[PDB]
């Protein structure tokens, strides 16, 4: 009707977002070399 007491209550909320971070990449990188060439081709119908 007209009133509002001082009872105890609480609410719970959640969030779902993204964020950006910064790190140290140093100077020397990974020794990712290249070795030979690998291929795989097969023709069944129409094209290859």
């Amino acid at each position: 009707t007209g009133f509002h007491p001082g009872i105890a209550f609480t609410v719970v909320r959640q969030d779902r977002f993204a964020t950006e971070q910064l790190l140290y990449a140093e100077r020397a990188s990974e020794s990712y070399f290249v070795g030979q060439i690998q291929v795989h081709h097969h023709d069944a119908i129409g094209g290859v």
Partner: protein, 48 residues
């Protein structure tokens, strides 16, 4: 009954018409011939 050797032998199938890969070809010629010599010797002994 062998699968690793067959997979290694059939995994190349060339790429586009490159060189013969003399080192790999020599290694394969050595290993396959060495295996086949004793394989055929055992087969001949068994048949005899």
């Amino acid at each position: 009954a062998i699968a690793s050797e067959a997979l290694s032998l059939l995994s190349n199938t060339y790429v586009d018409g490159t060189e013969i890969d003399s080192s790999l070809r020599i290694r394969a010629i050595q290993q396959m011939a060495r295996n086949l010599r004793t394989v055929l010797d055992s087969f001949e002994r068994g048949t005899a």
